[PDB]
């Protein structure tokens, strides 16, 4: 898994690959690693697939409520503290390594969370088995005052790094953009550079090929 986040002049963006894997066998060729916490607070995660989704929803929920009860737009630092205290509670058994960002009344934000419950902040971050690849790219091409389009390339380039050079990552690239005054945009499959070349033969078996012993119909409705 390769996920990253890059802050830009008037907002923030995050991205990730799409390979889910049980050991060395790809389990989902295009699974979603970006999670909506609240309309404008998106989080990306690596680690145990289940936990990245779970801890993301559970908090997205506790947050949604919280907002309603305060008639205010949610704050990242809230999702953050919410996430960290939960993870820390679980001594690290919740394999969630998360990059959480978003925009709220106070400005733009970017942080990272390790499954043991420690947080970090910065203008660019990445995590996952593809961490090193991207991070290489980030350290190689980043600068302050990135525009929306320069940043998107940056975050994108970085994922590609992971895909190509890390077996644990692959397939497509997901991107999400959060700008200060606009609605947030979730670009699923911004890039699809790993399409299957047409297969060489078609295995359309002549019908009747399979031997059947008994045949029946099933009753659904009551």
């Amino acid at each position: 898994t390769t996920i990253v986040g890059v802050k830009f002049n008037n907002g923030v963006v995050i991205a990730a690959d799409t390979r889910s894997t049980q050991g060395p066998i790809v389990a989902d060729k295009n699974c979603a690693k970006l999670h909506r916490i609240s309309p404008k607070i998106w989080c990306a995660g690596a680690g145990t697939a289940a936990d990245t989704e779970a801890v993301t929803q559970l908090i997205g929920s506790n947050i949604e409520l919280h907002s309603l009860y305060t008639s205010r737009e949610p704050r990242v630092v809230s999702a953050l503290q919410m996430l960290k205290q939960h993870l820390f509670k679980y001594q690290g058994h919740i394999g969630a390594y998360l990059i959480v960002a978003g925009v709220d009344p106070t400005g733009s934000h970017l942080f990272s969370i390790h499954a043991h419950g420690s947080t970090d902040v910065g203008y660019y971050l990445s995590l996952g088995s593809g961490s090193l690849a991207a991070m290489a790219v980030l350290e190689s091409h980043w600068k302050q005052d990135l525009t929306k389009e320069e940043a998107i390339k940056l975050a994108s380039d970085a994922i590609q790094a992971g895909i190509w050079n890390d077996l644990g990552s692959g397939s497509n690239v997901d991107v999400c953009v959060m700008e200060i005054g606009k609605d947030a945009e979730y670009l699923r499959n911004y890039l699809t550079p790993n399409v299957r070349e047409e297969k060489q033969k078609s295995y359309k078996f002549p019908r009747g090929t399979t031997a059947v012993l008994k045949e029946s119909i099933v009753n659904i409705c009551d």
């Binding site: 060395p24 066998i25 050079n165 077996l167 299957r196 297969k199 078996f205 399979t210 031997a211």
Partner: protein
């Protein structure tokens, strides 16, 4: 403690037709999650119209190959340039391998070519010498994936003749060389999709009375 073994992943496959035989393997070499090389052949020509691959632990792989090629060299010397028959090359390798029965060559090896009566052939080995002549065999990381397919599309297992109330097996026709390549490529593309260790490239060595031919096709580098 020092663990004397590695696993470079990789995967290979061999199929034998009426009068030719093939042996292919991906061209990727890995270590844990990183990629060592996108092009490091592991299917070689050892003279006397014999192709062979040792897939598993690279070092142990390269060794066997070396020891064998050399064996062939000394065979000629010690036997007035007599040509080494495949059935014989087999028994030799059984000895090479079992030589190290207590410090095995962590490899699943296959070799292919033509037998004395000119028909094509393939032999595969346990990493400690169990050998048998087979119609086709895949080995290595994606062996579990591809083997079944072959049992199906090659030895026509489970297929039957349409309309025969499952009492007549599909006659055992024999694949054309051209048709064999199709299967290879597909077996690989399929392998590439589900196995993080497989990918990068496919090099195929083909064997006929006229010598030894090589073909190369690109794969998904993710």
């Amino acid at each position: 403690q020092f663990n004397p073994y590695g696993d470079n992943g990789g995967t290979i496959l061999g199929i034998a037709g009426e009068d030719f035989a093939v042996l292919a393997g991906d061209t990727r070499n890995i270590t844990d999650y990183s990629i060592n090389s996108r092009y490091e052949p592991k299917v070689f020509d050892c003279g006397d119209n014999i192709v062979m691959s040792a897939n598993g632990f690279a070092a142990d792989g390269d060794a066997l190959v070396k020891r064998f090629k050399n064996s062939v060299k000394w065979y000629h010397f010690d036997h007035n340039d007599k040509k080494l028959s495949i059935n014989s090359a087999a028994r030799n390798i059984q000895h090479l391998l079992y030589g190290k029965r207590f410090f095995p060559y962590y490899v699943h090896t296959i070799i292919a070519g033509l037998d004395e009566d000119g028909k094509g052939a393939v032999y595969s080995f346990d990493p400690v010498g169990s050998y048998e002549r087979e119609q086709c065999r895949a080995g290595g990381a994606a062996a579990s994936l591809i083997m079944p397919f072959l049992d199906n599309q090659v030895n026509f297992k489970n297929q039957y003749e349409p309309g025969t109330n499952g009492k007549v097996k599909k006659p055992l026709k024999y694949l054309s060389v051209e048709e064999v390549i199709k299967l290879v490529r597909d077996s690989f593309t399929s392998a590439t999709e589900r196995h993080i260790q497989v990918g990068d490239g496919l090099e195929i060595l083909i064997v006929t009375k006229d010598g030894v031919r090589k073909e190369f096709y690109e794969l998904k580098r993710d």
